[PDB]
Amino acid sequence: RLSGYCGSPWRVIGYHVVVWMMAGIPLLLFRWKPLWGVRLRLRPCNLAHAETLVIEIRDKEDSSWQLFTVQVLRYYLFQGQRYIWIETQQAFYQVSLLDHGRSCDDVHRSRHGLSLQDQMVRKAIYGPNVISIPVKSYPQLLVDEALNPYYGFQAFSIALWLADHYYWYALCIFLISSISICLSLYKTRKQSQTLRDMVKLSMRVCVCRPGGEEEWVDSSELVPGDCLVLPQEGGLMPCDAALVAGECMVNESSLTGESIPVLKTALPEGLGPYCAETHRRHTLFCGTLILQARAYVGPHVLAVVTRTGFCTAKGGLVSSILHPRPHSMKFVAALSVLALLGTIYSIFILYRNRVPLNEIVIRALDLVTVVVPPALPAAMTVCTLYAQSRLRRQGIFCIHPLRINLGGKLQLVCFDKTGTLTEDGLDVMGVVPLKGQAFLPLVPEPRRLPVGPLLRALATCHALGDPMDLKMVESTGWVQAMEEPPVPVSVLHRFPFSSALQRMSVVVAWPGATQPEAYVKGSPELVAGLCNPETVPTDFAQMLQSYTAAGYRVVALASKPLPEGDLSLLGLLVMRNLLKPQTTPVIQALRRTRIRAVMVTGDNLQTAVTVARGCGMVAPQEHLIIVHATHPERGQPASLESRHLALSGPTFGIIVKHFPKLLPKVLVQGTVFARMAPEQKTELVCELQKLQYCVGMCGDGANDCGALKAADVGISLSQAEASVVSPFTSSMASIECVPMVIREGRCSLDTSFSVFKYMALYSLTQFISVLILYTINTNLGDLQFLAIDLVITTTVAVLMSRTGPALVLGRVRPPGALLSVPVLSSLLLQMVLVTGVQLGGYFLTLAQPWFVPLNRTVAAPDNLPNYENTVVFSLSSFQYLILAAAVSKGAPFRRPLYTNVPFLVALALLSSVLVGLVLVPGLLQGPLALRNITDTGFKLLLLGLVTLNFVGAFMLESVLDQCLPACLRRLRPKRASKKRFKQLERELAEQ
Ligand code: ALF
Ligand SMILES: [Mg+2]
């Protein structure tokens, strides 16, 4: 990204502090884009060699960052990256490796150990080795989360309610909002604390010094440029190191996800630039568990430190998941302009009828805050809490309830090979060559088939920690081994595996009758070449190349009778990933429901294609895409095994380096991505989300943490340090946890849409009720308002979010747009219908024989009792339940409506109490302050009107649920939009 920086330290000491303390009042609105507020007070225009306040200018992007420059040499912090100031270059440069300017291999040989000098300046420039996690206090979280326009409007509404006699419900809303705020702050603080505890590390390391002395200091004192000694026993790697002498076996499961040894060699050649990307076979990354180290020269291994902190992607992952981590804004705006037209119309009415003498600033703001209800967040959050409780009862832990509503529009789910789809360990089923005479290739054979020396070798050759040895001993049927049933065999000594010899030997000296034999295990080529004088090989390389192309691990065994010079091949041992039987139905249902599923793995491409073919991801065909090389003047060949594509690490890098061309095609048609780095996975997730894709990552290891956090939703299995930010977390390791989560998300989205529609209808009908009441010049009592807002709103919010998800996955996803055509059309029709039926009763009772008419001279809260106010209250209380029953759904993708017994009995009790309060007076309208009319014919007509409005709302819902004019009249169709569908149609047309 192309961006600049500029500034100046101070203008002048003086009245500037008073200016700041007097202009910090509009800071609430100056929070977003504070560059204008900063330049309005403190912004000198002069030479810019020394700066303290740094501002960000918009050159290619649209952002605004505020940074502070500290003096130690001056530098500032920006997205976790240090930027020191160079006096010779007169410009800011990033603190990282010198590979950008000039690099070579001679300095890596000449940097063997550093003295006490030049260490403090390097520590001040590069910073500490530990990754400092920025923690914030409680007021910091308060100012960061709160003080948005929504909470400001809610506080204004609360103050307005406190100004009136609305104390009870106002303090109720205040206390529930406070509980929600404290809960969110506690959750955020716990997340920050566990993230800081996971990221931080402290252990003793050995640092070499010039002269021939070694000291043990803390890991924070490690600065790029010294020498690090790897322990022989192994341990956690706190910083990046480059091998200079000797070789070591290290586990790269923190970056790939496989617990296999990685071949790491030294650097015997020199005079070459250090790219740190193509030399992965020489240097090793940080955070890798050390298994075994060795060196042919020197008493200890020699390794030089090249980069620490936010350089070797360690802090890079955190800085990439923290800061740039990626229908809202039109419904509230449409309700605001609608309220503005309604609040000014009431002013003209009040100024003419009674002239309330400055009581209009209270009645108009009342309608303003009634149009926009404050109980919407609670009514939308109760459903998420119910869904989280249901998931926890099922066995799925959730930490963020706001992601449940977003989890209903999933269309792309990522699956990991190791851990998620398969197990972490390596299993075994038997030995394919039943004889040691180079048998012809065939299907693999199960266990228990060999017997005698072969069975003894397969059951005794083990270093028992190692999951493969455990699988072998549990599959061989022998558990000193009992139930042989011949005489048991005993071992005396075993040779530990090392890096110098790739063959593990095991000697046996049992006192049995026959001659004992020694069994070894290692690379197949070595034992095959060694056993040549004993037995001849026939079709030996074909089996190895087939197992390598099919993603199989080869293990050979040899035997030699004794009373490593001579050996005799007996059989070959193979390994599998043990594909779970429950994985196939899940992906089958996903492909049936038109839910795209891709595979993101860190191993080679051959194993990825093998797993995809075994599970059934690519049914029609499978295509592989590989690039010739990385240097310019390259090509894009086509290799053969809708259309699915397979990519690799460097392949995806070369594709993403060509962003302005053919990248959306690869993102749409490509489904297999092997050897993907954590940063590469995060970049792929970001690029996919840039195409309006609801990508959902699902993994258990620590390598895919960046992709799991950068995605919209993250499913975490096998609880570990990589499950502290991900909202979805399942206790079991089964793959069937995805369909239930998708169903719960769809149900929550449908319930949230229904709640939003009901709230909009309630707000609009209350608005028109207040309008007609101001036309009549009378106001309802505060007690009635409180009673309604409790026993209707809380009742529906508790008894409408209990509906469970559908039985099976739906064919079509629910609409995730609150401003669509049918949703708006049905809402407008219901609104005009309720407006036509509500004011009708007033016009009807105006013609009926009426007694003791009201006088429009007394104040609004003093004209009670009267007929108009009580009939308006009755009509509104009836229409509330009418709308609540009309917006109730759940047939397509949820539980049936008749299954909700509590909601049904609550609606029945509400209707009963309403008809009791309407028909018969006494003992029910005492504190309600009503006229207590005794007109039987009027009550019968009101019940008939309620019934006809009921059946009319039912007919309207039934005819609007067909959406026939929304589909049959779609000319022109929905083309020229939904870029995913456009790319799909372009791909199916051009191919
Ligand atoms: F364990 Al992986 F991609 F193979 F996270
Ligand atoms: Mg994994």
Question: What DSSP assignment string belongs to 590-655?
Answer: HHHTT-EEEEE-SS-HHHHHHHHHHHTS-SS--EE---S-SSSS-----EE----EEE-HHHHHHH
Task: Please tell me what DSSP assigns to residue 753.
Answer: H
Cα–Cα distances (Å) from 922 to 29, 82, 918, 919, in that order, read 54, 77, 10, 10
Max Cα distance, the chain (Å)? 125
Given its phi and psi angles, is residue 230 left (phi above 0), alpha (psi -120 to 50 degrees) or beta?
Answer: beta
What the block records as the tokens of 101 is 């300017």
Instruction: Please give the distance, rounded to the nearest whole angstrom, from the Cα atom of residue 714 to the centre of ligand 2.
Output: 14
Distance 687 CA to ligand 1 centre (A): 20
Separation between Cα atoms, residue 683 and residue 680, nearest integer Å = 5
Class of domain 204-322: mainly beta
Distance, in Å, from the CA atom of 601 to the CA atom of 684, rounded to the nearest integer, reads: 13
Q: Which residues pair with 569 in a beta bridge?
A: 558
898 backbone dihedrals φ, ψ, rounded to 5° = -70, -15
Tokens, residue 888: 């109730």
Contacts 24+ apart (CB under 8 A), 977-981: 978/692, 979/664, 979/691, 979/692, 980/668, 980/691, 980/692, 980/693
Is residue 684 within 8 A of residue 664, CB to CB? The reply is: no
CB 363 within 8 A of CB 353: no
C-beta 746 within 6 A of ligand 1: no
Distance in angstroms (rounded) separating the CA atoms of residues 805 and 893: 7
List phi, psi (to 5°) of 788: -65, -55
Pairing of strands 623-624, 645-647: parallel
Report which DSSP code applies to 862: G
Query: Is residue 435 helix, strand or coil?
Result: coil
Residue 458 CA to residue 431 CA, distance in Å, equals 9
Tell me the three state secondary structure of residue 277. coil
With CA atoms as reference, report the closest residue to 111 among 223, 215, 17. Answer: 223
Q: Which residues contact 74 (CB under 8 A, 6 or more apart)?
A: 50, 84, 85
d(Cα 710, Cα 554) in Å, to the nearest integer?
A: 37
Structure tokens at 178: 């406070």
Instruction: Give percent helix, percent strand, percent coil of the chain, each to the nearest 5.
Output: 40, 15, 45
Helices and strands, number each (H, E), in the chain: 32, 30
Could you give the 3-state DSSP secondary structure of residue 861? Answer: helix
Instruction: Round to whole Å and give the CA distance between 64 and 665.
Output: 33
* H helix or E strand, kind and range, residue 457: helix 453-460
**Is there a binding annotation on residue 105?**
no
Q: Give CA–CA dist 140/127, Å, rounded.
A: 25
Give me the residue label for tokens 């640092």: 207
d(CA 220, CA 979): 49
Q: Are 392 and 398 in contact (CB under 8 A)?
A: yes
Instruction: Check if the beta carbon of residue 680 is closer than 8 Å to that of residue 652.
Output: yes
Phi, psi of 858 (to 5 degrees): -75, 165
Query: How many angstroms does the Cα of residue 731 sit away from the middle of ligand 1?
Result: 19
Q: The tokens of 577 are what?
A: 């990933």
**DSSP letter string, 512-559:** -SSPPEEEEEE-HHHHHHHTTTTS--SS-HHHHHHHHHTT--EEEEEE
State if residue 312 touches ligand 1 by the CB under 6 angstroms criterion: no
Question: What tokens does 412 get?
Answer: 């792309």
Ligand 1: which of 704, 709, 715 to mutate, judged by most atoms within 8 Å of the beta carbon? 704
* CB of 699 sitting under 6 A from ligand 1: yes
How far, in Å, is the centroid of ligand 1 from the Cα of 625? 20
Residue 754 phi/psi, 5° resolution? -65, -40
Query: What's the token pair of residue 407?
Result: 């989890």
For ligand 1, whether the C-beta of 602 sits within 6 Å is yes
Residue 257 near ligand 1, beta carbon < 6 Å:
yes
Mutate to test the pocket of ligand 1, among 424, 603, 726 (most ligand atoms within 8 A of CB): 603
| Contacts (Cβ under 8 Å, ≥6 apart) of 678 | 255, 313, 317, 703, 704, 705, 706, 707
Closest to 201 measured CA to CA, from 229, 227, 231, 239: 239
Calpha distance 797→381 (Å, rounded):
9
* Residue of 416, 603, 712, 750 with catalytic role: 416
- Does the beta carbon of 614 sit less than 6 angstroms from any atom of ligand 1? no
- The CA distance from 583 to 422, in Å, is 9
Q: What angle do CA 887, 752, 371 make, to 5 degrees?
A: 70
Which residue out of 414, 416, 426 has the highest number of ligand 1 atoms within 8 Å of its CB and is therefore the one to mutate?
Answer: 416
> What tokens were used for 151?
């909470």
Q: What CATH class is the domain 403-424+579-731?
A: alpha beta
Is-contact 237 288, C-beta < 8 A?
yes
CATH T-level assignment (fold) for domain 484-574: Calcium-transporting ATPase, cytoplasmic domain N (3.40.1110)
Which amino acid would we find at residue 614? G
362 φ, ψ (degrees, to nearest 5): -95, -40
With tokens 């060196």, the residue in question is 295
Residue nearest to ligand 1 atom 3, measured at CA: 601
Q: If you take atom 2 of ligand 1, which residue's CA is the nearest one?
A: 257
Contacting residues for 885 by C-beta, under 8 A, at least 6 apart: 907, 950, 953
Quote the crossing angle between the two packed helices 314-322 and 678-689, to the nearest 10°.
20
Enter the DSSP assignment of 860: G
For residue 419 and ligand 1, the question of a CB distance below 6 A is answered with yes
Burial class of residue 296 in the structure, from the number of CB atoms within 10 Å of its CB (0-12 exposed, 13-18 middle, 19+ buried): exposed
Whole-angstrom Cα distance, residue 583 to residue 790? 48
| 253 touches ligand 1 (CB under 6 Å) | no
Q: Are 187 and 145 a contacting pair, CB within 8 Å?
A: no
Phi, psi values for residue 595, rounded to 5°: -105, 115
Is residue 240 part of an annotated ligand binding site? no
Tell which residue, 728, 743, 672, 655, has the closest CA to residue 697.
Answer: 728
How many whole angstroms from 543 Cα to the centroid of ligand 1? 27
Place of tokens 């699956």: 415
Q: Is 424 among the residues known to form the active site?
A: no
Q: Is 601 in the pocket of ligand 1 (CB under 6 A)?
A: yes
Ligand 1 centroid–CA 701 distance in Å is: 7
For residues 648 and 680, the answer to whether their CB atoms sit within 8 Å is: no
Check residue 243 and report its DSSP letter.
Answer: E
Ligand 1: which atom is nearest the Cα of residue 704?
5
Label residue 124 exposed, middle or buried (CB < 10 Å: 0-12, 13-18, 19+): middle
Exposed (0-12), middle (13-18) or buried (19+): which is 667, by Cβ within 10 Å? buried
Q: Distance of CA 539 to CAs 243, 516, 535, 572, Å?
A: 39, 30, 13, 13
Instruction: Give the single-character DSSP code of 79.
Output: T
In contact, 619 and 592? CB cutoff 8 Å: no
155's tokens = 């506080």
Tokens representing 406 are 């977003």
Radius of gyration for the chain, computed over Cα atoms and rounded to the nearest angstrom: 37
Query: How many other β-carbons are positioned within 10 Å of the β-carbon of residue 186?
Result: 12
Cα–ligand 2 centroid distance for 746 (angstroms): 27
Cα 497-499-504 angle, rounded to 5 deg? 30
Q: Using alpha carbons, select from 204, 215, 289, 282 the residue that is nearest to residue 226.
A: 215
Judged on CB neighbours under 10 Å (0-12, 13-18, 19+), 279 is middle
Minimal-distance CA residue to ligand 1 atom 5: 257
Torsion of CA 449, 451, 455, 457, to 10 degrees: -140
In the block, tokens 């996803």 appear at 813
Query: Distance between alpha carbon 788 and the CA centroid of its chain, in Å?
Result: 40
Q: Which atom of ligand 1 is nearest to the CA of 417?
A: 4
Can you give the residue ranges of every domain in the chain? 5-95, 138-199, 204-322, 403-424+579-731, 484-574, 749-960
* Residue 318 region by backbone torsions, left for phi larger than 0, else alpha for psi between -120 and 50, else beta: alpha
How far apart (Å, rounded) are the C-alpha atoms in residues 972 and 588? Answer: 34
Residue 938 and residue 191: Cα distance in Å, rounded? 61
The answer to whether 550 and 559 have CB atoms below 8 angstroms apart is: no
- Looking at the CA of residue 258, tell me the nearest atom of ligand 1: 1
CA nearest neighbour of 762 among 872, 883, 906? 883
Sign of CA dihedral 363, 364, 369, 372: positive
Q: Which residue has the tokens 């061309």?
A: 661
CB atoms within 10 A of CB 118: 11
CA distance 753 to 117: 66
Residue of 670, 693, 694, 695 whose CA lies nearest to 987? 670
The H-or-E segment that residue 798 falls in is: helix 795-799
Tokens (6 digits) for 372:
């926009």
Among residues 797, 753, 752, 764, the alpha carbon closest in space to that of 372 is found at 764
| Residues contacting 808, CB < 8 A, separation 6+ | none
Nearest to residue 108, comparing CAs of 300, 342, 299, 269?
Answer: 269
Broken C–N links (> 2.5 Å) in the chain, after residues: 72, 326, 464, 479, 563, 641
